[PDB]
């Protein structure tokens, strides 16, 4: 079971953001799906969902601006937010949700469904199912149950009038004066790029030990930059090539940079 | 509105930790609260759903409870992997209207103290041949997560051009941070040397880099 968000990473104000979640591992005709979003440094926020019966419900405060649809054949849920602002910048998560309106009866009483009654009065609590027509009746107690079952990885969407910009990748070469005897730190500077995010791997994933991709800084220019470093054996600086594989989906860009060792 | 959780909560390894999630009757009073775990760089993780019931894959040290309009998440023996953010959630007036809590940042104290290893990178040829210069000071493998970074040009203060990240964990649960000095290639060649000075736990490590050579 997996949920993969797709769509734009940047959206100008007053326009309409639209995402699509493609589902696998299960059958969309057997689960409810929804959308959660989280603004940076803010709490989770609920958007909406659409259940097995194609019925959609929304965050009351955001219903007028929301639109969720679904295609059970294409295994694909869709979200749309209208007239977005910078407040709509957030990471948008696709989720399988468990929504249940639950009716329960006091102790000793029983619901019509459990009595096996059905009909028009199929929603009351009964004193004894032994006699439907002479039993005492209570209105049920209503509890609403909500769970997010599985979470999608998320998709960061930024709302800004500024334009997309890919990254410049500069090597952080390890000098013979920046070694630490046995180990040496080399990296890649990912400079000037918008919007977030950037991800960095090394040797096409085949190098994992010692790696740390730092968070991004927001320069005064309105562009983001970060660095990815890995500490490697200092004896291998001439015998093992080290390539950082940067990836910036917001501009469909992907960079590979040889980090060559400084002559000194 | 949102469910009131504590901003942050602390707890040392092995100890017991509890996170409160207070609301009202229409939401938390409805008796079906859920708890989720968010580790940075990982998809949020569902922990507790049926007020007390554990989801699939959840260890038994996690446990849920509720007393009226205040839920509670309880970790019996805190681990290092348990350092993260934790959100409660409840439906209000309908199953399609969900409210989340303000969130709580859980800190796992008790890690060994560690001293930072600092490296300073001068502007590269590539970055220079494009009319830019950026010095990259990378700070790793230290605990606790509170460093002070100072930039000096010929031992004088750099009062501008500095963007610094807040420290964040790495795969080994130690902290790491980064500071940048953004210069024109003329300010690079202007001075004799630049210095990144990292003060962590009464020590100051200064790495120096010179335009003359390497």
Residue numbers in the entry:
A (entry chain H): 2 to 82, 82A, 82B, 82C, 83 to 159, 161 to 263
B (entry chain L): 2 to 9, 11 to 27, 27A, 27B, 28 to 95, 95A, 95B, 96 to 106, ...
Task: Give verbatim lines from the article.
The cow antibody repertoire contains a unique subset (~10%) of antibodies possessing ultralong CDRH3s, which can reach lengths between 50 to 70 amino acids. The unique CDRH3 structure can be separated into two microdomains where the antigen-binding disulfide-bound “knob” sits on top of a long b-ribbon “stalk” and can bind to both surface and receded epitopes. Ultimately, we isolated a total of 8 and 11 cross-clade nAbs from cow-485 and cow-488, respectively, all of which had ultralong CDRH3s, suggesting only ultralong antibodies were responsible for cross-clade neutralization detected in sera. BnAbs from cow-485 were named Bess, while bnAbs from cow-488 were named ElsE and assigned numbers based on their order of discovery.
The ElsE Fabs all have CDRH3s with 54 amino acids and 4 cysteines, with a 1–3, 2–4 connectivity, Bess7 has a 61-amino acid CDRH3 with 8 cysteines (1–6, 2–5, 3–7, 4–8 connectivity), while the 55-amino acid CDRH3 knob region for Bess 4 (6 Cys, 1–3, 2–5, 4–6 connectivity) has no ordered electron density in the crystal structure. Ultralong bovine CDRH3 knob regions fold with 3 short β-strands connected by 2 loops (Loop1, Loop2) of varying lengths that can adopt a multitude of different secondary structures, including loops, helices and β-turns. The ElsE series of Fabs all have highly similar knob structures as expected from their high sequence similarity. Flexibility in the stalk is evident in a comparison of the ElsE family of structures that have similar CDRH3 knob sequences and structures, but very different orientations of knob domains with respect to the body of the Fab. For example, there are two Fabs in the ElsE11 asymmetric unit with a relative difference in the knob orientation of ~114°. The ability of the knobs to twist and rotate with respect to the body of the Fab likely enhances the ability of bovine Fabs to access recessed epitopes. There is no convincing electron density to indicate tyrosine sulfation modifications in any of the antibody CDRH3 regions; however, BLI experiments indicate that Bess7, with 3 tyrosines in CDRH3, contains one or more sulfated tyrosines. Low sulfate occupancy or flexibility in the CDRH3 knob region may explain the lack of electron density for these groups. The ElsE lineage was the most potent and broad overall.
